[PDB]
Ligand binder design. Structure first.
Ligand code: HEM
Ligand SMILES: C[C@]12CC[C@H](O)CC1=CC[C@@H]1[C@@H]2CC[C@]2(C)C(c3cccnc3)=CC[C@@H]12
Length: 466
């Protein structure tokens, strides 16, 4: 009896389980690095820290490209901006300019810390009005980080109730919904196989974002003054005029897309990580208690938390690290591409090949982490409890090398201060129908969590101390 001709083969079911996990499970059979061919395109998945660092750092330049995707073409206006732009002059310039802008916020009058604390104050005052009630903290937190990133991009913010905030939220949700069904990584390109309206819907949401950004740029062409460079838009406009090989790379569209990447990332990443952190604390009341104890003893109630408090609030800084391990914002980073013929772990990799780092695998490798599927912030502390440690070399929440996260400083500060101020001021408890958030998650371009509610109450201790 003969065997059928095989015209296709995939190692697991599509749309069943999470991609990053399915790739991980495959490592038991096939090892830490393997490939899949889809028509013409070849993709390599890497799931061990040694090989990953070779791709991100040692041979960083070789693998610093980004593959092209139809959905991403639309969001990025054909591969402009930073995150989805191929390696090249545009990417390098705009990335550099964006980084240079965060320097303008490291100290002084417009210090990043104060900008953030300003908006966390408004957030806390608003949340306190919901004393006694169960609520979804998504929108209130969304506003807070939106204002922070707006101040950094334009030196503007939004008053309570500005409906432009509801507009942004709508298109943010719609774009994220249609940019990918699940992860950006998608074995079969269903998009091109069956008739569908994904690109149509995606365009309609992107159009609204772009119209709003254009509106902002046009209104700002007048307020721009050369001697005063205080925000990201200033920096980008100052560069364009400074010419005078550089000027074609700073068109209006190049500038808006870059601002768009920053505005989007600044808001959806940090918002997501905050929700994830709360969710874990509702599942782990023992940890939560230890965090209240820690903050009462090291900051108390006579002032509000500041960045310098990260030197004393160690369990908090560790809790954040452990969320970023267990539920990475980008569990498969963003896809990389080989710019040139090269190699990984002595295996050949052709120019143009897609390369994916399975960070989830790195963060859950059993030989590198003790009980990796557990939420244990303790692992990032010495046994004493008195200083932070790095227990594994297999940890890269913000990536590394040329395409590493450029918003890391901002993220870490936003996350630390938000959690700090909330814990000082609020009991955050399971709602009265004792529903706990699902920790399973929803993979999109970002690793999101199902919406959930939290009962919020002002703390007796915080009240007494007024
Ligand atoms: C918890 C928060 C965040 C985490 C864990 C995070 C992590 C990451 C990761 C894993 C990557 C991909 C690295 C790669 O593709 O090799 C990335 C890229 C990027 N991140 Fe974030 N990020 C966070 C927040 C932010 C924020 C607040 C910004 C604000 C500007 C930002 C801006 C970017 C940009 C522009 C890229 C593209 C880099 C490039 O292609 O050159 N991120 N980030
Ligand atoms: C789609 C979205 C967010 C929805 C916006 O309407 C469009 C947008 C621009 C930037 C995207 C961002 C989602 C987060 C992305 C993909 C991101 C990011 C994501 C996670 C970690 N670090 C960076 C950088 C580009 C960011």
């Amino acid at each position: 009896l003969l065997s059928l001709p095989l015209v296709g083969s995939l190692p697991f079911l599509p749309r069943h389980g999470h991609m990053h996990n399915n790739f991980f499970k495959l490592q038991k059979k096939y090892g830490p690095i393997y490939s899949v061919r889809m028509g013409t395109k070849t993709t390599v998945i890497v799931g061990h820290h040694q090989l990953a660092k070779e791709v991100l750092i040692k041979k960083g330049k070789d693998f610093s490209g980004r593959p092209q995707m139809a959905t991403l073409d639309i969001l990025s206006n054909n591969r402009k901006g930073i995150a989805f732009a191929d390696s090249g002059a545009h990417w390098q310039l705009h990335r550099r300019l964006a980084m240079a802008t965060f320097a303008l916020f490291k100290d002084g009058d417009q210090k990043l810390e104060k900008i953030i604390c300003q908006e966390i104050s408004t957030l806390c005052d608003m949340l306190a009005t919901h004393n006694g009630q169960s609520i979804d903290i998504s929108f209130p937190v969304f506003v807070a980080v939106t204002n922070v990133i707006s101040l950094i991009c334009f030196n503007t913010s939004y008053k309570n109730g500005d409906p432009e905030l509801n507009v942004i939220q709508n298109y943010n949700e719609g774009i994220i919904d249609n940019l990918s069904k699940d992860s950006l990584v998608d074995l079969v390109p269903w998009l091109k196989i069956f008739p569908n309206k994904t690109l149509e819907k995606l365009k309609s949401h992107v159009k609204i974002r772009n119209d709003l950004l254009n509106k902002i740029l046009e209104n700002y062409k007048e307020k721009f003054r050369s001697d005063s460079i205080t925000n990201m838009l200033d920096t980008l406009m100052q560069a364009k005029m400074n010419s005078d090989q550089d000027s074609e790379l700073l068109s209006d569209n190049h500038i808006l897309t870059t601002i768009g990447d920053i505005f989007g990332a600044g808001v959806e990443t940090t918002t997501s990580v905050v929700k994830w952190t709360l969710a874990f604390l509702l599942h782990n009341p023992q940890v939560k208690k230890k965090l209240y104890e820690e903050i009462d003893q090291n900051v108390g109630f006579s002032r509000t938390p500041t960045i310098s408090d990260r030197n004393r609030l160690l369990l908090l800084e560790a809790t954040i690290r452990e969320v970023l391990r267990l539920r990475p914002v980008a569990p498969m980073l963003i896809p990389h591409k080989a710019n040139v013929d090269s190699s990984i772990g002595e295996f050949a990799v052709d120019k143009g090949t897609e390369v994916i780092i399975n960070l989830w695998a790195l963060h859950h490798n059993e030989k590198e982490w003790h009980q990796p599927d557990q939420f244990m912030p303790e692992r990032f502390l010495n046994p004493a409890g008195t200083q932070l440690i790095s227990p594994s070399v297999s940890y890269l929440p913000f990536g590394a090398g040329p395409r590493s996260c450029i918003g890391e400083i901002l993220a870490r500060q936003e996350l630390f201060l938000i959690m700090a101020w909330l814990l000082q001021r609020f009991d955050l408890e399971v709602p009265d129908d004792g529903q706990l958030p699902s920790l399973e998650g929803i993979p999109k371009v970002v690793f999101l969590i199902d919406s959930f509610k939290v009962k919020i109450k002002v703390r007796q201790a915080w009240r007494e101390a007024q």
